[PDB]
Amino acid sequence: TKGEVRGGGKKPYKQKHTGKARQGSTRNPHFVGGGIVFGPKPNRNYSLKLNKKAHTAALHTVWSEKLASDNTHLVDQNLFNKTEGKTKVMMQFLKSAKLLDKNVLFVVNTLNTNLEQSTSNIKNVQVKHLDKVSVRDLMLANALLVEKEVLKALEGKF
Amino acid sequence: MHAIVVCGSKQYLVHENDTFFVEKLEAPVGKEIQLDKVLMLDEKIGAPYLEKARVVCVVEKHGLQRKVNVIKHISQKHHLKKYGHRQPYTKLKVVRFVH
Amino acid sequence: MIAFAKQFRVRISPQKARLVCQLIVGKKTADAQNILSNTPKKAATLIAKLLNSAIANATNNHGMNGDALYVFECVANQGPSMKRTIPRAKGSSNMITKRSSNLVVKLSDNPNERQELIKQQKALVKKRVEGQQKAKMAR
Amino acid sequence: LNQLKSVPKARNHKTKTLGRGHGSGLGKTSGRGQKGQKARKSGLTRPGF
Amino acid sequence: MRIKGGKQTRVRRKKWLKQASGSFGTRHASYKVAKQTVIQAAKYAYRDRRNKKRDFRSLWILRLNAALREQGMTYSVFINLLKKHNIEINRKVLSELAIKEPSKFNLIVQKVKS
Amino acid sequence: KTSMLTKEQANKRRQWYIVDAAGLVLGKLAVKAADLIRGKNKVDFTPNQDCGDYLIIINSDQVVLTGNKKENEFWYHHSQYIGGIKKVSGRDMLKKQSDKLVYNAVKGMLPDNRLSRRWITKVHVFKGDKHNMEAQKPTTLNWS
Amino acid sequence: AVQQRRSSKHRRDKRRSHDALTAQALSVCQKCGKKKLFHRVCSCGMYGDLRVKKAY
RNA sequence: UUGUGGUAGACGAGCGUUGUAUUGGAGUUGAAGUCAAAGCGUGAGCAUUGGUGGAUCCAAUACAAGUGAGAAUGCCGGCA
RNA sequence: UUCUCGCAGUCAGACAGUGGGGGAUAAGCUUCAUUGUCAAGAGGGGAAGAGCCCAGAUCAUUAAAUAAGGUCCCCAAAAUA
RNA sequence: GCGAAACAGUACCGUGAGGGAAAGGUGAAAAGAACCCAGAGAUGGGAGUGAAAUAGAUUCUGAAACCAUAUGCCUACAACGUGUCAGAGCACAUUAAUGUGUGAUGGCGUGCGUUUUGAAGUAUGAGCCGGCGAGUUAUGAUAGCAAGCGUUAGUUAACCA
């Protein structure tokens, strides 16, 4: 802002016997060269506090309404096997399962290297671990292929 | 041959084949409307209205006057409430204005 | 057609150029150059040189009649001038600018071509209104 | 709820833009009178004072 | 996020200059004087929106009084013969437009007689 | 809402008229003369046109003045200068200019307007009756 | 004194109304070409039908 | 039914802008910006087309603002 | 307009009448208590008026009846005894 | 926007401690205009190139202010904050709409803010136009709204994956 820019420290004009405002300074917000008092500064935390149980309840409710979206079919590591992670067979598998429209998520507990290799160049699709998905990342997928193992964890977390 | 027709509180002289604009009315275009409030048709006068007088009119269109933009403002007092309005009207003509 | 030739910013007072072209307004080729030649103004010579150049271009690049041409429209266009400064007494100087004029003269060869511009504007508004109307068909 | 229509039930309140327009005043008036000591910069007093 | 907006200000100023034109002077080419004139003319129109009927009433009354001085009596006499006896609800302006069509108000003046 | 006003426009006619001035009181004859010139009796009065009539006054010397006003009220005139105040009585006007007195009085009764001058032009006051206005088809009457 | 009220463009042109310049005087030369200046010599060196001047 | 004068001052309801976030669409067969127009809006506005012009944005919902300009003998530039 | 809470705001008012004080019972003067008005409130009449009398403006309304006041004309309308 | 996207701490000012700026955009590739004409030439327009030269180096667009020209209307008796409402007349032809533009004349008509008891004022601010141009945030408390949670509730702080 105005006070954080170097420059002169004098009135650029005499005080009396003038025909203008006396002066603010050579460095003024109303003068060219910046100096706006208000704006972005590295002091704002940009964070808010929420209750843990509140987030658990929100996730439970969005999973409840997500489970009724009839796009929550089951998946298992078996089909994540029999593949090298190359997108070719992955592309065939997604196309056969009409997943081009969907941004489907794949919940997983172990994150096998083959699935990590696959889908790495498709911005439409995304994949992470079970305990790393947010509500925005959950409802934006429009579909999710669920794993048997994560059911126990989600039931425990309620 | 003439007729003094009252609409609202406005009186109008009309004859055969006369078109005029009056206040916005119901019974939209295409429908005949027979007003019984009309005086001074032909040399006969009733006190409130002419007796048995029936003037039948057909509406040509429903229109709007140009949007007057009215202001309220008193100098050196900082108030500038602004408002605009289009005045609905009905353009219509008479056919018979029978007795 | 026009037979114009822009001068591109000669330094002269625009008012004087406007005055001399008023002295030459309406006049034809036979009765303009003669009077323009011996009048005692320098801008007179300035406009005369360009008028002769424009006549030469009209004869060469257009091949018009060249014997019924007259000034259709004078202009005096103020080009970007320079900022010069001369000191003035008691420490209060001033900046003096040398006014520059952009000079061009259109040459017409008939009592018309002014209403034809109005016809062009009429065609412009006509195509505008039909385009608006043709759009209403889709509406 | 989807990002195309994400709305809460209700949360909004009137804000004081002390130097914007004339709708709710909120301009030169600043909602603090005119030509007053409080209207000046840091126009106030010590809490106890 | 620093924002400089000129399009909206430009269109606002243009639209506030658009209402009025044909003014003696470059007043219809600026913002300040143009806006001041627009507001002053709006006040003028607000006052004239009643001054016009104020003047129309006087015009009607003057014309009916002239027509009645052709008949030969004061304007006040004819009014008193419209409510109790010889009941007429015809209004002032129509009694004037009955004059622009002559040989028709003579029926009225013969009606107001005994 | 409103009834379309109907008036007359682009119509102009000014019938020539003749009056003979007599011992009648100046003010009460002159008010009627003014309203007739402007046309305050016409059933079709038109403010922006003022379709009045032409009028000629004969023998203005015969007018008499009541009371002491012949030697009580005196008309002044200042042209442009200090000391230019020149004041004459009513009987002095009888010797020099009686027509001009009526002229100025009527002009005073007429509001100061661009057309008011054009209306007073329609007044021709004469101390006698010598003029070529008989070819203009005048109208002789009284109490104008 | 100095200017108190500014002159408008309308006032400017009202003041400049007298800016119209009068024309000159011309004369016919029987021997040379273009119309010469009246009571003045011609470009061909001749004047009262009289050449006394060298190269123009 | 009362009704709607209103500064200081208090409450309510909004419009408009930048960018983000996903949700749809347009486009060198002409989008944005630009100027004019004989429209639409209760209001801040919305446009529709003509021509300049050749490249990016727009509709809807929230989000967070260096967000709404006639004035401070306000600043720059040009023009009077 | 009773109680709580949020929230300003001003402590420079002005004038006419009413009872006054000062003053010289002079002042568009000052100092109070009452009504009223402007400020924050437009309108008509008083010729032009912050203050007087008649009055309290949502928008349209080339409709009417009215308040004070007024009807020779300017400038809207009246005369009779 | 680091003052400083350029040959910027440079130009400049001072004898010095110091102060201190502005000025990007050709085209897809200069293919930057062979050649012609008039002028001493610059230059101008042709040609010619180029998709296009109202893209020609003043170089993306070229707004308002300001300066001229002209379609058409009105204006040389005329007392006005220059306009409003009427209103013939004149010139006409639209975002089809009591179509538009000007206005002989009539009626009406002491600007916009500032602060003052009260400002139409001879109180002040404004030459004009365009751009820029001044109630946020950190922690803290209070009051209101809403939701979650829930009467041995809860929230977690700093922090750790």
Q: Give Cβ neighbours of residue C49 (< 8 Å, ≥ 6 apart).
A: none
Distance CA E56, CA C90 (A): 69
Distance CA F99, CA F58 (A): 10
Interface mutation target, options B13, B50, B79, B83, chain E, most CBs of E under 10 Å? B13
Dihedral angle computed from the Cα positions of residues F99, F101, F103 and F107, in that order, rounded to the nearest 10 degrees = 180
Q: Which nucleotide is nearest to B84 (CA to C1')?
A: H42
User: Which E positions 27-86 lie with beta carbon below 8 A of chain B?
Assistant: 39, 42-43, 45-46
Interface mutation target, options A37, A38, A103, A139, chain D, most CBs of D under 10 Å? A139
CB atoms within 10 A of CB G15: 10
E20 touches chain B (CB under 8 A): no
Contact across the interface for F43 and E67, Cβ inside 8 Å: yes
Do E and F make contact via 3 or more CB pairs under 8 A? The reply is: yes
Range of the domain at C122: 4-135
- Specify the resolution in Å: 6.3
**What value does the CA radius of gyration of chain B take, rounded to a whole number of Å?**
18
Q: Give Cβ neighbours of residue C33 (< 8 Å, ≥ 6 apart).
A: C48, C51, C52
Two structure tokens written together for D16: 């004081």
The conformation of residue F3, written as its DSSP 8-state character, comes to P
Two structure tokens written together for G6: 């500014």
Two structure tokens written together for E76: 């006040």
Distance CA G11, CA C129 (A): 40
Distance CA E36, CA E13 (A): 13
Give CB contacts under 8 A, 24+ apart, made by E68-74: E69/F41, E70/F41, E70/F43, E71/E109
Q: Is the CB of D34 under 7 A from strand H?
A: yes
Q: C60-75 burial string, b = 16+ CB within 10 Å, else e?
A: eeeebeeeebbbbebb
Distance CA F17, CA F21 (A): 13
Do D and E make contact via 3 or more CB pairs under 8 A? The reply is: no
Pair C80, C9: CB distance under 8 Å: yes
Distance C11 CA to J24 C1' (A): 30
CB atoms within 10 A of CB E108: 18
Q: Which nucleotide is nearest to A1 (CA to C1')?
A: H66
Name the experiment that determined this structure. cryo-EM
Distance CA C37, CA C30 (A): 12
Strands, sheet with A105-106, edge to edge from the N-terminal-most edge strand? A74-75, A144-147, A105-106
User: B92: which chain F residues are within 8 Å (Cβ-Cβ)?
Assistant: none
CA atoms within 13 A on the CB side of C80: 0
Which of these, A150, A118, A158, lies nearest to A132 by C-alpha position? Answer: A150
Q: Give Cβ neighbours of residue C39 (< 8 Å, ≥ 6 apart).
A: C20, C23, G24
**What value does the CA radius of gyration of chain G take, rounded to a whole number of Å?**
22
**What value does the CA radius of gyration of chain D take, rounded to a whole number of Å?**
18
Distance CA E113, CA F25 (A): 35
Distance CA E108, CA E92 (A): 13
Pair B85, B70: CB distance under 8 Å: yes
Q: Which of helix, strand or coil describes residue G9? A: helix
Q: Where are the alpha helices (DSSP H) in chain A?
A: 52-67, 77-80, 87-96, 113-117, 135-139, 150-157
Which position has the token pair 């002769």?
Answer: C52
Q: Which nucleotide is nearest to B12 (CA to C1')?
A: I63
Q: Give Cβ neighbours of residue A89 (< 8 Å, ≥ 6 apart).
A: A83
CB atoms within 10 A of CB F28: 10
Distance CA F15, CA F137 (A): 8
CA distance D11 to chain B (A): 29
Pair C27, C72: CB distance under 8 Å: no
Q: A22-47 burial string, b = 16+ CB within 10 Å, else e?
A: eeebebeeeeeeebeeeeeeeeeeee
CA distance F46 to chain B (A): 21
Q: Distances from the Cα of F94 to the Cαs of C55, F91, F106, in angstroms? A: 79, 5, 17
The bridge status of strand C94-102 relative to strand C77-86 is: antiparallel
CA atoms within 13 A on the CB side of A135: 16
Contact across the interface for E43 and B71, Cβ inside 8 Å: yes
Pair F106, F93: CB distance under 8 Å: no
Phi, psi of F11 (to 5 degrees): -110, 130
Distance CA B56, CA B33 (A): 6
Pair B50, F41: CB distance under 8 Å: no
Q: Which amino acid is at A21?
A: A
Q: Which nucleotides of J are covered by protein (CB under 7 A)?
A: 1-4, 9, 18-22, 36-39, 41-46, 58, 63-71, 77-79, 81-89, 94-98, 101-109, 111-116, 119-121, 127-139, 144-149, 154-157
Q: F72-89 burial string, b = 16+ CB within 10 Å, else e?
A: eeeeeeeeeeeeeeeeeb
Start-to-end CA distance of chain E, whole Å, equals 89
Distance CA F91, CA A98 (A): 120
D34 touches chain B (CB under 8 A): no
Element of type H or E holding F28: helix F26-38
Per the DSSP assignment, residues forming a β-bridge with B88 are: B64
The bridge status of strand C105-108 relative to strand F123-125 is: unpaired
Per the DSSP assignment, residues forming a β-bridge with C70 are: C28, C108
Q: Distances from the Cα of C43 to the Cαs of A89, C15, E55, E109, in angstroms? A: 85, 11, 61, 81
Give the number of beta-carbon pairs within 8 Å between E and G.
Answer: 5
Pair B32, B58: CB distance under 8 Å: yes
Tally the domains of chain C: 1
CATH number at residue C118: 3.90.470.10
3-class secondary structure per residue, chain B: CCEEEEECCEEEEECCCCEEEEECCCCCCCCEEEECCEECCCCCCCCCCCCCCCEEEEEEEEEECCCEEEECCCCCCCCCCEEEECCEEEEEEECCCCC
